[PDB]
Design a protein around this nucleic acid. Structure first.
Ligand SMILES: *P(=O)(O)OCC(C)(C)[C@@H](O)C(=O)NCCC(=O)NCCS
Lengths: 134, 72, 50, 50, 135
DNA sequence: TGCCGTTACAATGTAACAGTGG
DNA sequence: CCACTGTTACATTGTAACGGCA
């Protein structure tokens, strides 16, 4: 356990995620009958502003197949929330043309390094080549 | 494995049944693959195993058994 | 010098790989579609040569 | 009865014609570009080998 | 114009964009009154299966703020949709740590080329070393 | 094993720059 | 000039797959 978990924050995250999924059409609840599903969704909607009861709501009506996805989404949300405080711990997202990405991933898989490590090593070698020439 | 990756490629590049593609099943007569179809089959076989084949030695391949023989 | 030439050779190799993969993917998709239209909607209804 | 049957016939006709129009066009397109890409790829392959 | 503009597709894109924006809570309407805004949104909702009228609904009730974001988003969506046909024209999204990205962006701004071009030059120097080692 | 960090993506939205033609 | 388009460099959120550890 590296990042401390805060209930009033992660519960709001879970509520927002479930509301988003419901608005997206995902079946939040395990009830195939539409009446029970709608009733549970209404309970959730009126359940806003409550961690201790949204957790119970999840335990009681949550769709079995979404547990893993919700858990990993909350994991990622927690990690990003804690890393977004400092500049050096943040992550920069870019888009690479498919050939360039293909070659870079080929190198990374070949050497066992990650994309960041592979690019760092390559840049260091480029600098070393510059110094060699210079 | 190679001997079943060959069937995977042949069936999904010619659309014929897995049962149809036996070792001795010739492409043109059994599987029905014509000029361009056989060209695409050999191209896919090249792509699967990330290798290259000579033109003449490739065109010599005209059967599942020959295909595997050159692949393995 | 030979290395310099092999650089262009490798460039052409990458180009050929790209084109071959594209064509192979297209053929695989076409075959899958043909096998999904075994419902007899393809003989004339889908294949309008006009 | 006449109204219902006419509506059914019109709906069937329109649906079928529009679905065929929507699908066959892209199908023929994909076929044409597949042929063109194969033609393009052969020359690259031939040059590469030598 | 490099990408063909299709009306019945861009209209659907625009309608989906408006609906998504509204359900996110933003004021797509130009109306400050609640009743007129609600009526305009309801009419837009009715316009789901008629993308052609969506252009007119835009000209009548779309918030003046959104022209730039609208014209940006649909343009980008068109580019991506037409590039997605072939792999070699697609784009790949990757994430980089701040130190690594900082160094890479500084190098690229030094060389005056895009990130992909800088990576191409870098990987090409590495591959030149590999090639010379191989010969 | 199940949780927890971590990576490498995918999909969509925006700001900013560079081109193009009216 | 001005508008509209193409492109790059991000952000934002979600997900699957590894691998560490109780
Ligand atoms: P199918 O009867 O359409 O025949 C296709 C083909 C065998 C002619 C074609 O795939 C092909 O091989 N074309 C190139 C022939 C050749 O060897 N050219 C030299 C290199 S460009």
């Amino acid at each position: 356990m590296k990042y401390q978990q805060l209930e009033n924050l992660e519960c709001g995250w879970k509520w927002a995620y479930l509301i988003r999924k419901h608005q997206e059409g995902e079946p939040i609840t395990k009830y195939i009958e539409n009446s029970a599903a709608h009733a549970a969704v209404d309970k959730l909607i009126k359940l806003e502003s409550e961690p201790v009861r949204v957790l119970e709501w999840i335990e009681q009506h949550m769709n079995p197949d979404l547990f893993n996805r919700m858990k990993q989404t909350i994991r990622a949300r927690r990690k990003r929330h804690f890393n977004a405080e400092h500049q050096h711990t943040r992550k920069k997202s870019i888009d690479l043309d498919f050939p360039v990405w293909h070659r870079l991933s080929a190198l990374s898989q070949r050497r066992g390094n990650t994309l960041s490590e592979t690019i760092v090593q390559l840049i260091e070698d480029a600098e070393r080549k510059e110094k060699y020439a210079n | 494995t190679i001997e079943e990756r060959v069937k995977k490629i042949i069936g999904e590049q010619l659309g014929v049944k897995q049962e149809e593609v036996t070792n001795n099943a010739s492409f043109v007569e059994d599987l029905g693959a014509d000029s361009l179809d056989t060209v695409e089959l050999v191209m896919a076989l090249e792509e699967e195993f990330d290798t290259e084949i000579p033109d003449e030695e490739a065109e010599k391949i005209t059967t599942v058994q020959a295909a595997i023989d050159y692949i393995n | 010098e030979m290395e310099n030439v092999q650089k262009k050779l490798r460039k052409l190799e990458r180009d050929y790989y790209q084109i071959r993969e594209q064509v192979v993917s297209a053929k695989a998709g076409w075959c899958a579609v043909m096998r999904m239209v075994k419902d007899n909607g393809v003989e004339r209804r889908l294949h309008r040569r006009e | 009865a006449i109204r219902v049957t006419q509506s059914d016939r019109d709906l069937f006709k329109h649906l079928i014609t529009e679905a065929t129009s929507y699908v066959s066009a892209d199908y023929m397109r994909h076929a044409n570009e597949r042929r063109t890409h194969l033609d393009e790829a052969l020359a690259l392959r031939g040059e590469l080998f030598g």
